[PDB]
């Protein structure tokens, strides 16, 4: 997150941190995710695509810092890794950029609710907030596009949903942005999501609930003028989610 505030997981209790193990001893951060129900976390397919070996990823819930522990955190193994069939990336966009991870702890249980672990709500079929709505994004991604490390403390920030008409303007992303995507930016192009925030949530209030409206997917640079962040439009993938989360 470029700009934003530093926060704690009690402020985003559905945020999931996904890491990968390496033979050698290190564990490196990969992407964020969100908890939809006790056993499923949703993230982005582009985060796993190059290394789809589920046994090598670890998922932690209730985590406020990146490499140090938070009290109350839960560690899980990835029981199932469902990537989207039809996922495609081009010179910028990622299409159908959503993935599901079924988690299991070493004792065989799924997540348990606490003051730091809560689920986030799914929108109703093709139901979205109107553009102009302010939504928040959270994550452990870069703070400046030139950094080569990720922050240790969790960050958050607020961005506004913009319309497709605005996003598809030639000098923004043209037709690279489709109907299964949403664009969100900061009026002053000051704060935004960046690498590492990928897979994480875009939360807006819909019909009174905090709903998972988007998943951080792609964008040109970070906090660049006329280059919004593009999110997978969750409301349009509900059938796909259902298919696997029944």
């Amino acid at each position: 997150i470029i700009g934003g505030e530093f926060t704690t997981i009690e402020n985003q209790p559905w945020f999931a941190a996904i890491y990968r193990r390496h033979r050698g001893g290190s564990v490196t951060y990969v992407c964020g995710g969100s908890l939809m129900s006790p056993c499923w976390v949703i993230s982005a397919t582009h985060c796993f695509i190059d290394y789809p070996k589920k046994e090598d990823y670890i998922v932690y819930l209730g985590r406020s810092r990146l490499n140090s522990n938070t009290q109350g955190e839960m560690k899980f193994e990835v029981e199932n890794l469902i990537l989207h069939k039809d996922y495609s990336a081009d010179t910028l966009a990622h299409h159908n950029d959503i993935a599901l991870l079924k988690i299991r702890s070493k004792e065989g249980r799924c997540a348990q609710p606490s003051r730091t672990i809560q689920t986030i709500c799914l929108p109703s079929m093709y139901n979205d907030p109107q553009f102009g709505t302010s939504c928040e994004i959270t994550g452990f991604g870069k703070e400046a596009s030139t950094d080569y490390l990720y922050p240790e403390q969790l960050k958050m920030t607020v961005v506004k949903l913009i319309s497709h008409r605005e996003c598809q303007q030639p000098h923004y992303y043209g037709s690279e942005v489709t109907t299964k995507m949403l664009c969100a930016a900061d009026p002053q192009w000051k704060t935004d999501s960046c690498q590492g925030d990928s897979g994480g949530p875009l939360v807006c209030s819909l019909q009174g609930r905090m709903t998972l409206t988007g998943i951080v997917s792609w964008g040109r640079g970070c906090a660049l003028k006329d280059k919004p962040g593009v999110y997978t439009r969750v409301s349009h993938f509900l059938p796909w989610i259902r298919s696997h989360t029944k």
Binding site: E10, N11, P113, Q118, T119, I120, C121, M210
Partner: peptide, 10 residues
């Protein structure tokens, strides 16, 4: 207690 999606508790 139990899960209530979208609810934070502070």
């Amino acid at each position: 207690l139990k899960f209530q999606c979208g609810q934070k508790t502070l």
